[PDB]
């Protein structure tokens, strides 16, 4: 069979032949008691670069082995790329949402062999769900894999809005010193009310980070946390989204894309908000208004946007967020740090020998199965 | 009477007329139970830009409606001062660590009218302690102010550093994409080891920020922390640094500059340290040989350093820390968020409040009462 696989390109020195550090950290379970992946076997060491064209998520010896045809690209964009090549003869498409290879209506009615629609990583709306469910295509992804990344550059983006650390460090480097400039919008987050949309494992785990800050936490859901959560963390619960949003300083967003939240945060939405709120969207970048999110930095409404998040990805040269005042954007990278990648890759395993062995793949880490949402998918993600 | 008080420049295009946010959290308290200032009342909406020339630490309505001289400068370097043109008969010397009107033996024989220098924040070395009480002088800063904001400032820098955020915003800001150039070096923190060298206000409040990452925590001081406060946060203790520094990916750097921590990140320190480790220091620069750091992120031995602190201070245009690779450095600026002004700034008038009226200063904010010793 054909394992197409579409992944980022190298770095652009090459493929890295040493790394800054000789091991990371071993992480065998999440704090809702899932277990991190468990693949039977792993051809690559946690911390290489997996992710990449020369990464190949560390597949390459065991598909070759099972006697498959493994495609590894890059080239994924209009009808003369290598990815629309293969696509009509794939039994599995993976990709990362870093870099996704798109499956809208029309290339999953060129895909005629496809069964299997891997995400390297979490979120799989780069795939048109409906479309999935009509041609009875399996849809997954690694749940938990890189949740605590991602919450991790979620504070760090918070932080450094509310400081004001990337003006100040442009200061630093260009010789500077400017102390005035620096601060004449730098803050402290402590004593400020820090709201998620959704509270799952990136928005749980950003509010566990949030705690010992001594901010004001709240949370907006379709379902509540436990009680015993709430009071652990202080939580203040609202049921519309638009309640919280009146009273945070700072609002990150933490939900699936997916009809309920595409242009969530819209004009209307934002207008809300307080005048110099936060966001930080590690999300999906359609959760936001694109040009309403420029507008209301522009105008002051807010005081800062960032996020690892864009559409489409990758992002053009020219998209606003780049440039917008006090933005504080990277690329997609929170979830493919290299210690996230280790979890996604061994996951990516773990579902592939499930499937080529016929054994059940976890419940977690189902989106579509079956001609239905299914799942994960069933709990986090709707359909029109 | 006058006040003579000394405060950074304005911004470059000028004092703000406008802020990003029309009001900041009311803080009243610190974790070790000392409370938040206490003025009387104050001429300042908590958020504005105090510590520079045009914000006057919000006293000139105050001080003059008493029928005080109030004399605002950022000029204080040398004889020819506007600051040492005023200091013979200043009665109050203020200023804050940020930018610090000194004052050494010399200047303290020659200001003879002063009986109040006044730190506007934390860090009064640029006062002479032994010539102040001569002088029955007395010196006080704002205790606790600006800790928790010293504290946000090195826990951003340590995620920054760790997850490789800069360099990938100059990859965003500047039109790429370029995701394994931004991740061949970013990692989680979850998991790590990180240790501080010494557990004051701000490491405190550093490893109790630090804790939900799942981070495994160490600290290195003279004196430990108490049983209970251990347990709490999981810490392990070491007796001696170089036993830390060996097992941590992080070191976070919170102690006084003094001869057993000067220079303790050299050469031969730095490679005790894990290949690929990282070195915050918000604390003073000077813990750190300046080219040791720099030969150490060059080699690859560190994986990066950042902080807000320099030698000298303010840094030289050229400083080999501005431009360094896997730099995380702002200027100095962490206690000085307008946050930390708000606070420094009230608890500046509550001790001006207690003196013109006759009543103690909070024993909190005295560092030395050459007054009481003069008795
Ligand atoms: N690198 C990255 O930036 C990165 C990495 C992983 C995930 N993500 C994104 O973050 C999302 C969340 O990831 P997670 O691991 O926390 O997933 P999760 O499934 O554990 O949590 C998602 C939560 O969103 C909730 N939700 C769904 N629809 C909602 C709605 N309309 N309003 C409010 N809440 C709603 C779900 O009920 C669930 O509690 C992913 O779907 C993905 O899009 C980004
Ligand atoms: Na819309």
């Known amino acids: 069979a054909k394992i197409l696989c579409v992944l980022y390109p190298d770095p652009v020195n090459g ?54 045809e493994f495609i590894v690209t890059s080239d994924k964009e209009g009808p003369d790329s290598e990815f629309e090549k293969h696509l009509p003869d794939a039994e599995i498409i993976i990709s990362q949402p870093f870099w996704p290879a798109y499956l809208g209506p029309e290339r999953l009615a060129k895909a005629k062999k496809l069964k299997l629609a891997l995400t390297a990583g979490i979120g799989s709306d780069h795939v048109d769900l409906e479309s999935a469910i009509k041609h009875g295509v399996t849809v997954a992804e690694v749940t938990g894999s890189n949740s605590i990344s991602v919450s991790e550059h979620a504070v760090m983006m918070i932080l450094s809005l509310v400081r004001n650390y990337i003006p100040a460090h442009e200061w630093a480097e260009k010789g500077g010193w400017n102390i005035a400039d620096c601060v004449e919008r730098s803050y402290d987050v402590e004593g400020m009310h820090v709201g998620t949309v ?15 800050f001594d901010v004001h936490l709240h949370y907006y859901a379709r379902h509540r946390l436990s009680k015993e959560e709430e009071e652990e963390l202080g939580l203040t619960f609202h049921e519309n989204v638009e309640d919280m949003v009146k009273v945070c300083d700072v609002v990150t967003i933490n939900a699936p894309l997916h009809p309920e939240t595409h242009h969530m945060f819209d004009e209307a939405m934002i207008k809300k908000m307080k005048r110099g709120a936060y966001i930080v969207n590690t999300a999906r970048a359609e959760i936001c208004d694109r040009d309403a999110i420029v507008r209301a930095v522009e105008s002051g409404h807010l005081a800062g946007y960032a996020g690892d998040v864009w559409n489409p990805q990758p992002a053009p040269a020219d998209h606003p967020w780049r440039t917008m005042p006090w933005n504080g954007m990277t690329p997609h990278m929170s979830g493919t740090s290299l210690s996230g990648q280790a979890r996604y890759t061994a996951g990516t395993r773990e579902i592939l020998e499930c499937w080529f062995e016929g054994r059940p793949i976890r419940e977690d880490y189902v989106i579509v199965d079956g001609g239905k949402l299914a799942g994960t998918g069933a709990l986090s993600y709707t359909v029109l």
Do not use: C
């Open 15 to 68: 493929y890295p032949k040493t790394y800054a550090r000789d091991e990371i950290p071993n992480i065998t379970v999440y704090d809702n008691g899932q277990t991190a992946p468990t693949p039977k076997a792993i051809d690559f060491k946690p911390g290489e670069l997996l992710g990449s064209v020369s990464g190949e998520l560390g597949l390459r010896k065991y598909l070759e082995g099972l006697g498959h």
């Open 198 to 212: 959704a509270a799952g494992r990136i928005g749980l785990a950003i509010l566990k980070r949030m705690k010992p």
